[PDB]
């Protein structure tokens, strides 16, 4: 259980900025698509965005079904695969995880039991170190 | 004017289907709106 | 019996009838996943699953299938 690569695509990882930028001050949340392999290269194809009441230090998905509407939309090109993992935002706070994330992040490992979080910090991401 | 009816019911049948539609799309943004208060 | 998806895209099956009572529904997939129901969302064609009107007037057939979701929350 190492040397696990993570490989991202460059089309996932801009639309993770861009609305993990706009909702600044206010936090923001989405969601991942990909595939697991074997053990190594838990790979991300592309993300989105479900719907939520953003703060500062906090937020949810108001909308359950925005998620469950629209990858039954995207099959018809089915541009994509199914669901690998879960984004957060901790804007300009460093990159962790807390008490809250862990409850939510523990069911999905019981649910599938190689899932992912993934943090970001755009405010001190910049041009050059990012930080995710 | 019995063709009245044959109609004028259908109008009807149709303004239901305008009235409904713009009931949601309101109820749509009058949930967003306490989401956001 | 019933189906239930994910939104990972897995399956799970369940061994039930027209006589369920979503609080002992909600316990089910804690009998299986482990999840408190309080991190549960279950849907029918856009329907949520309303705990209330109990599925008798759901028409959940044999076979059907349902999609669950889990709550989102960080901070």
């Given at each position: 259980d190492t040397k696990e690569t993570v490989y991202i695509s460059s089309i996932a990882l801009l639309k993770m900025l861009k609305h993990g930028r706009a909702g600044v001050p206010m936090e923001v949340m989405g969601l991942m698509l990909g595939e697991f392999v074997d053990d190594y290269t838990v790979n991300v194809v592309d993300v989105f965005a479900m719907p939520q009441s953003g703060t500062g230090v906090s937020?949810?998905?108001?909308?359950?079904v925005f998620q469950a509407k629209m990858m039954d939309m995207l099959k018809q090109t089915g541009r994509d695969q199914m669901v690998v993992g879960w984004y957060h935002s901790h804007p300009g706070f460093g990159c962790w995880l807390?008490?809250?994330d862990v409850n939510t992040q523990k069911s999905f490992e019981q649910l599938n039991s190689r899932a992912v979080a993934v943090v970001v910090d755009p405010i001190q991401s910049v041009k050059g170190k990012?930080?995710? | 004017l019995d063709n009245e009816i044959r109609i004028f019911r259908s109008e009807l049948q149709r303004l239901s289907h305008e009235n409904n539609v713009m009931l949601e799309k309101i109820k749509d943004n009058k949930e967003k709106i306490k989401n956001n208060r | 019996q019933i189906f239930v998806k994910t939104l990972t895209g897995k399956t799970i099956t369940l061994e039930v009838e027209s006589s369920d009572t979503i609080d002992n529904?909600?316990?089910k997939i804690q009998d299986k996943e482990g999840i408190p129901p309080d991190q549960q969302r279950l849907i029918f064609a856009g329907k949520q699953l309303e705990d209330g009107r109990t599925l008798?007037?759901?028409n959940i057939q044999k076979e059907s299938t349902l999609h669950l979701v889990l709550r989102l929350r960080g901070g």
């Amino acid at each position: 259980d190492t040397k696990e690569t993570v490989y991202i695509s460059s089309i996932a990882l801009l639309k993770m900025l861009k609305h993990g930028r706009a909702g600044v001050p206010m936090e923001v949340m989405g969601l991942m698509l990909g595939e697991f392999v074997d053990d190594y290269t838990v790979n991300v194809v592309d993300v989105f965005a479900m719907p939520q009441s953003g703060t500062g230090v906090s937020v949810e998905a108001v909308d359950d079904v925005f998620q469950a509407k629209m990858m039954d939309m995207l099959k018809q090109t089915g541009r994509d695969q199914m669901v690998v993992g879960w984004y957060h935002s901790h804007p300009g706070f460093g990159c962790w995880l807390s008490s809250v994330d862990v409850n939510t992040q523990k069911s999905f490992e019981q649910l599938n039991s190689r899932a992912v979080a993934v943090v970001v910090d755009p405010i001190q991401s910049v041009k050059g170190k990012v930080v995710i | 004017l019995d063709n009245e009816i044959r109609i004028f019911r259908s109008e009807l049948q149709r303004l239901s289907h305008e009235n409904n539609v713009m009931l949601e799309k309101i109820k749509d943004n009058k949930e967003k709106i306490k989401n956001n208060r | 019996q019933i189906f239930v998806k994910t939104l990972t895209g897995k399956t799970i099956t369940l061994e039930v009838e027209s006589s369920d009572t979503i609080d002992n529904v909600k316990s089910k997939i804690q009998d299986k996943e482990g999840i408190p129901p309080d991190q549960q969302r279950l849907i029918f064609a856009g329907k949520q699953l309303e705990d209330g009107r109990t599925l008798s007037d759901y028409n959940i057939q044999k076979e059907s299938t349902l999609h669950l979701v889990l709550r989102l929350r960080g901070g």
